[PDB]
Amino acid sequence: NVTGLFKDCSKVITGLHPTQAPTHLSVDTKFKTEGLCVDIPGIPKDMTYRRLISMMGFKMNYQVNGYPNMFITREEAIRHVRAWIGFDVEGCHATREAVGTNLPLQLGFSTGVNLVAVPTGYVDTPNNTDFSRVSAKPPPGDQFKHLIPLMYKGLPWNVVRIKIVQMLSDTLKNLSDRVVFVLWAHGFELTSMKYFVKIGPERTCCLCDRRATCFSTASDTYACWHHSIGFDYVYNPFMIDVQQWGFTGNLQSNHDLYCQVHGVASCDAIMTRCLAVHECFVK
Amino acid sequence: AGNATEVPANSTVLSFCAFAVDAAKAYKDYLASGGQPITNCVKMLCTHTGTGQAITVTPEANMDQESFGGASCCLYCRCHIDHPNPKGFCDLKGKYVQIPTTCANDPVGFTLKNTVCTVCGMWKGYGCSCD
Ligand SMILES: CN(Cc1ccccc1)C(N)=O
Ligand SMILES: [Mg+2]
Ligand SMILES: [Mg+2]
Ligand SMILES: [Zn+2]
Ligand SMILES: [Zn+2]
Ligand SMILES: [Zn+2]
Ligand SMILES: [Zn+2]
């Protein structure tokens, strides 16, 4: 059995040299024998490759002492209803030098905010992983025709994550000590969180005794929602996937059973938080 | 489309370390909480008549070591995250790493926790002989 997490999306017909392959699966077939690999003097390493690696398939089911769980129960989410922020991401597909993965394009929140990112991926090279712009195309359908101009209106991820942190801090500083992202079919939203979320042990703000909700890579410091100006990462967020609550059918059909006033990533994010409130607080 | 690089047994640990502020501490803490070491490393079939040096251009395992492909023993390569040196370049990717047989159940953790002697090129404690 294999997973799609870290799937190599390059179009290169060969695998990697045993010294450069991250795993036994990715070593080129020529080097494989007896369940192991051999070094073959005369077959050199590749010193110019750029292999796009898929961030689809994360599983946050770790249980490590002192690290809070990201995915919480419905009952814990109910206790923190003030922290709820619906979150949905519309993506674009990898193209040209790579195929097989989706990149975040439009990031929408129940605050009505939509942020457009430059199509960016994690590209393995002979020396490291390069977080960089990649070739991409919008999904082929007509219900996503609004995404076509967005391919030319994106912001670099270093700006996008500052804006996410700023938006959440402004919305939540007077509501909660945390954020609970309310999702519907969480896979792609969790893939998108790799671009702006960091986790670890519970920390305190550097300026007050509140729990830290933000992290700054530039200073290696932590902050609550009140003191996060200039911070680039959301730290120890929480989340719940409304789709996993036993619903049959798509988000809109279930949302529309209780609500007729919400009719685009922010719109899906609004409908997700809306369906969650109606399902948890009625009956 | 695309070719899988991983197996489901590594999803949890790799996801945890891929999101961590401090990936090295996250892997050590994951192991301390009873997590299984990262598997699917590039283990080499070799003569075991090598020099026994820690990081080499060809496999150099002696009779008390196993040789592995370098990138496969690097937590930062495995999680596709930043390497913590100022230049951001890896010292294991593109080389082979020799790991003591007693520690070959967790090559990623072995390289994370251990250091190579800059004088003799052997792992400190396994067995750098120069004091
Ligand atoms: C071993 N493979 C398949 C593969 C290639 C690249 C990444 C993962 C698997 C070859 N030789 O194409
Ligand atoms: Mg979704
Ligand atoms: Mg959507
Ligand atoms: Zn504070
Ligand atoms: Zn509604
Ligand atoms: Zn590395
Ligand atoms: Zn020495």
By Cβ distance, the residue of B15, B59, B81 closest to A58 is B15
Closest ligand relative to B116 C-alpha: 7
Considering its fold, how many domains does chain A have in total? Answer: 1
Which residue owns the Cα nearest ligand 1 atom 7? A26
Domain containing residue A79: 74-119+137-281
CB–CB of A183/A272 below 8 Å? Answer: yes
Q: Which atom of ligand 1 is nearest to the CA of A21?
A: 7
Distance CA B100, CA B64 (A): 6
Query: Is residue A167 in some structural domain?
Result: yes
- Domain membership flag for residue A54: no
Residue A94 lies in a domain: yes
> SS3 of A121, please?
strand
Positions of A marked active-site: 88, 90, 189, 268
Partner B, chain A 97-136, Cβ-Cβ below 8 Å: 99-101, 122, 124, 126-129
Of A238, A217, A236, A231, give the one whose Cα is nearest residue A169.
A231
Q: Look up residue A107 and give its amino acid.
A: L
- Residue A60 falls within a domain, yes or no? no
Residues of A with Cβ-Cβ distance to B32 under 8 angstroms? 65
Among the listed residues A59, B73, A39, A259, the one whose alpha carbon sits nearest the alpha carbon of residue A251:
A259
Method by which the model was determined: X-ray
Per domain, the residue ranges of chain B are 8-113
CB of A186 closer than 8 Å to CB of A129: no
Instruction: Decide if B44 and A25 are in contact by the 8 Å CB cutoff.
Output: no
Closest CA to A195 of A212, A217, A173, A176: A217
Whether residue A78 lies inside any domain: the answer is yes
Does residue A79 sit within a domain?
yes
- Tell me the CA–centroid distance for residue A223 and ligand 4, in Å: 5
Domain assignment present for A9 = no
DSSP chain B: --B----GGGHHHHHHHHHBSSHHHHHHHHHHTTPPPP----BB---S-S---SEESS----TTEEEEEGGGG-HHHHHT---SSTT---SSTTSEEEEEGGGTT-HHHHHHH--B-TTT-SBTTBB----
Confirm if B69 and B96 have CB atoms less than 8 A apart.
yes
By C-alpha distance, the chain A residue nearest B55 is: A19
Note whether B44 and A18 are within 8 A (CB): yes
| Contact criterion met (CB < 8 Å) for B30 and A64 | yes
Residue B71 near residue A20 (C-beta atoms within 8 A): yes
CATH of residue A269's domain is 3.30.420
Neighbour tally for A167: CB within 10 Å: 16
Task: Give the DSSP H or E segment for A18.
Answer: none
C-beta of A15 in contact with ligand 1 (< 6 A): yes
Sheet containing A120-124: order of strands: A51-53, A120-124, A129-133
Distance, CA of A65 to CA of B86 (rounded, Å): 30
> Do B41 and A24 count as a contact with CB atoms less than 8 A apart?
yes
Q: What residue ranges in chain A does DSSP mark as E strands?
A: 32-33, 36-37, 51-53, 84-94, 102-109, 114-116, 120-124, 129-133, 136-137, 180-183, 197-198, 214-216, 221-223, 233-235, 238-241
Tell me the three state secondary structure of residue A105: strand
